[PDB]
Amino acid sequence: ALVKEEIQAKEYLENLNKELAKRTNVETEAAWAYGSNITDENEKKKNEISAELAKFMKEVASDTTKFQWRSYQSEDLKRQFKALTKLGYAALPEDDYAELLDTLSAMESNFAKVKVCDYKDSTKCDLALDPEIEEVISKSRDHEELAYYWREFYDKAGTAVRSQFERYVELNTKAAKLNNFTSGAEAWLDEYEDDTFEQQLEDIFADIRPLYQQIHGYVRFRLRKHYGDAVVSETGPIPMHLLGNMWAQQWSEIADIVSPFPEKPLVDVSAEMEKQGYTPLKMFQMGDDFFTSMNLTKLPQDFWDKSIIEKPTDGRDLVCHASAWDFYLIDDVRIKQCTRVTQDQLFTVHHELGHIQYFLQYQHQPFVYRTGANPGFHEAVGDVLSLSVSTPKHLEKIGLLKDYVRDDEARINQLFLTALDKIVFLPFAFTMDKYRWSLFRGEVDKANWNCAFWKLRDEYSGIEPPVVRSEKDFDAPAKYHISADVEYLRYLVSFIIQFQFYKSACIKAGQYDPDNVELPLDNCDIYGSAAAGAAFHNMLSMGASKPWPDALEAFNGERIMSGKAIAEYFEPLRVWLEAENIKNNVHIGWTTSNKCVS
Ligand SMILES: *[C@@H]1O[C@H](CO)[C@@H](O[C@@H]2O[C@H](CO)[C@@H](O[C@@H]3O[C@H](CO[C@H]4O[C@H](CO)[C@@H](O)[C@H](O)[C@@H]4O)[C@@H](O)[C@H](O[C@H]4O[C@H](CO[C@@H]5O[C@H](CO)[C@@H](O)[C@H](O)[C@@H]5O)[C@@H](O)[C@H](O)[C@@H]4O)[C@@H]3O)[C@H](O)[C@H]2NC(C)=O)[C@H](O)[C@H]1NC(C)=O
Ligand SMILES: *[C@@H]1O[C@H](CO)[C@@H](O)[C@H](O)[C@H]1NC(C)=O
Ligand SMILES: *[C@@H]1O[C@H](CO)[C@@H](O)[C@H](O)[C@H]1NC(C)=O
Numbered sequence: 001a002l003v004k005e006e007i008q009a010k011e012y013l014e015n016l017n018k019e020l021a022k023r024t025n026v027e028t029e030a031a032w033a034y035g036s037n038i039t040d041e042n043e044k045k046k047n048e049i050s051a052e053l054a055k056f057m058k059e060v061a062s063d064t065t066k067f068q069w070r071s072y073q074s075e076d077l078k079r080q081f082k083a084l085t086k087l088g089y090a091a092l093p094e095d096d097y098a099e100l101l102d103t104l105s106a107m108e109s110n111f112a113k114v115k116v117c118d119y120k121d122s123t124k125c126d127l128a129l130d131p132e133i134e135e136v137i138s139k140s141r142d143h144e145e146l147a148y149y150w151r152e153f154y155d156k157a158g159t160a161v162r163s164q165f166e167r168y169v170e171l172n173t174k175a176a177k178l179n180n181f182t183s184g185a186e187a188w189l190d191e192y193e194d195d196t197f198e199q200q201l202e203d204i205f206a207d208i209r210p211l212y213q214q215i216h217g218y219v220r221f222r223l224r225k226h227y228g229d230a231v232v233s234e235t236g237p238i239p240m241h242l243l244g245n246m247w248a249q250q251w252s253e254i255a256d257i258v259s260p261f262p263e264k265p266l267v268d269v270s271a272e273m274e275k276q277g278y279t280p281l282k283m284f285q286m287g288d289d290f291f292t293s294m295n296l297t298k299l300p301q302d303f304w305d306k307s308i309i310e311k312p313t314d315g316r317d318l319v320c321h322a323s324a325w326d327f328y329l330i331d332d333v334r335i336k337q338c339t340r341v342t343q344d345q346l347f348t349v350h351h352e353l354g355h356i357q358y359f360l361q362y363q364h365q366p367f368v369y370r371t372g373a374n375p376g377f378h379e380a381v382g383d384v385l386s387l388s389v390s391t392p393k394h395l396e397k398i399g400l401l402k403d404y405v406r407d408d409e410a411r412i413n414q415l416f417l418t419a420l421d422k423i424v425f426l427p428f429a430f431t432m433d434k435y436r437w438s439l440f441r442g443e444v445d446k447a448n449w450n451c452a453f454w455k456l457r458d459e460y461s462g463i464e465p466p467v468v469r470s471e472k473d474f475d476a477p478a479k480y481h482i483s484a485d486v487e488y489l490r491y492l493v494s495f496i497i498q499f500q501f502y503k504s505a506c507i508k509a510g511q512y513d514p515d516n517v518e519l520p521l522d523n524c525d526i527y528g529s530a531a532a533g534a535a536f537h538n539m540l541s542m543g544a545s546k547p548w549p550d551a552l553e554a555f556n557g558e559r560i561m562s563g564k565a566i567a568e569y570f571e572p573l574r575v576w577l578e579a580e581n582i583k584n585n586v587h588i589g590w591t592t593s594n595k596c597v598s
């Protein structure tokens with residue numbers, strides 16, 4: 001019975017893979033329509049399609065129980081069946097499932113329709129996060145203006161959806177239990193296929209905390225000289241609204257005021273991008289070039305015909321948060337980005353294009369294997385290229401960085417600017433899932449949900465709100481991914497493993513030798529390296545066909561997620577920075593925040 005049944009099973013899967021691909025295509029199309037044009041109508045359609053696919057997924061789960069799949073010889077077949085048993089939200093009773101979609105939709109659409117009044121003109125009330133409020137948080141050095149925009153934004157994107165958030169936690173939890181995980185924490189963590197994963201990340205975070213604390217301390221020092229001691233204390237958490245970003249996840253936008261050597265060059269090519277007439281189209285074409293230059297795959301025509309790479313001008317509602325989309329056919333991949341001509345946006349274009357490349361690289365695989373080896377792998381791909389693009393080396397080659405001397409002081413400036421984006425983010429990213437895990441697991445009482453957020457943010461990042469908050473506010477959904485039910489640990493894993501890929505890609509490209517001051521890891525450009533491209537191909541082409549350790553091994557021979565590489569990259573900075581903090585008697589650490597009242 002069992003040798004025969006295994007042969008039938010292979011044909012069952014082959015055939016079922018194709019059907020899921022096609023049914024997902026339709027669901028994706030409806031999601032796309034909504035996300036690119038928010039209306040009551042498109043909401044209904046997206047939600048009804050999803051409901052129907054959920055119903056089919058349930059029959060598929062049920063059909064898995066008819067096959068003796070755990071007894072089969074083929075690891076590969078067992079892997080595909082295992083994946084089909086994991087329903088996620090689709091396990092919910094029909095009505096509960098529809099209620100959950102309506103709750104998610106309410107939250108995501110609240111986020112995307114937020115608008116605030118101009119600080120200087122309360123008649124003018126149509127400022128959106130993207131682009132208006134983002135530009136003020138990133139450019140203004142008026143602490144009171146900054147604080148105003150912070151409060152207006154968090155009040156509308158966060159507090160306004162407490163009731164919905166709460167319902168979502170209930171449903172998320174119910175759904176996980178139906179799949180027999182303890183909570184949604186364990187449902188998310190199952191993607192990493194490793195029991196010790198949480199512990200591994202705590203270990204890695206603990207090894208990098210000291211460097212993070214040195215950075216924190218230095219930035220605080222510099223902010224005090226800018227804003228004065230009335231605005232920033234020596235010993236407390238940094239007021240977050242001064243850190244150049246609405247969530248303080250990255251601080252690179254205040255590099256003008258905290259850079260180690262302000263006499264020396266600090267790389268910001270936005271102004272040159274605008275002077276040379278760059279458009280979004282050019283930016284995407286440069287990204288394409290980067291990948292084709294490494295002998296990877298060209299964007300297909302469908303990409304250019306159907307992508308949305310600039311913010312519509314018909315004043316409609318849409319989700320402007322940048323995203324990459326697989327449509328599960330052949331060569332139908334798309335990006336929706338409300339692209340602006342800046343350095344940071346050029347990196348985002350590479351980031352998103354990294355997802356697109358992953359899609360194209362694994363599109364021959366069976367449907368259940370057409371995703372990342374783990375979610376962090378997907379988010380890392382494009383960032384490995386962004387690491388290169390951001391190098392002075394690369395930016396001189398493309399004519400965006402003019403008259404740059406690469407002295408020791410400019411290296412330090414560049415290193416620190418990178419650290420503001422890459423080290424700073426790690427605690428931030430860890431907290432976004434720690435908060436949510438703690439609610440999913442039932443560890444925090446509803447009475448304390450807002451202060452448990454800011455508590456994590458204090459303990460891990462050493463920041464706090466500009467104003468006093470309380471349990472009358474609900475601040476966590478003011479972050480896109482929280483409002484939209486996007487797991488965030490992927491981004492923590494990405495910011496660690498991308499240094500492992502980059503370092504390895506740099507070695508393959510000839511651009512990095514430890515024992516050679518002409519090839520330092522932080523000036524490595526892998527543009528043009530078919531040797532780097534080959535490693536990418538070997539790993540990305542695998543999809544989720546094997547456990548992620550085997551995908552990493554395809555790239556570089558390793559099997560372990562490790563913080564060695566990111567430390568190696570920042571080692572030069574750490575040595576200078578420790579010494580500079582001691583030279584200036586810089587206070588390190590912070591007192592417990594007093595900005596969330598229970
Ligand atoms: C999450 O964990 C849940 C437990 O916390 C789990 O729920 C259980 O799922 C079981 C599915 O295996 C289910 O098992 C069956 O139960 C039938 C009787 O149960 C009733 O009585 C209970 C009290 O006694 C009530 O509380 C329930 O509500 C039920 O109404 C059994 O009659 C049934 O049996 C048939 O199935 C087996 C088939 O199993 C195998 O397959 C082949 C052949 O098909 C065999 O050769 C093989 O060795 C093995 O037999 C047959 O052996 C048998 O002859 C019958 O045809 C079966 O045992 C159980 O009821 C349910 N329990 C509870 C408490 O809910 C969820 O499944 C988990 N969810 C996920 C997503 O994994
Ligand atoms: C947005 O979608 C609506 C349907 O709710 C449609 O009629 C409208 O014209 C759309 N706008 C664009 C530009 O797609
Ligand atoms: C480029 O990729 C192809 C597969 O598309 C491979 O066969 C070949 O070896 C690579 N070429 C170069 C320039 O190494």
Ligand SMILES: [Zn+2]
Binds near residue numbers: 351352355378379
């Ligand atoms: Zn991404």
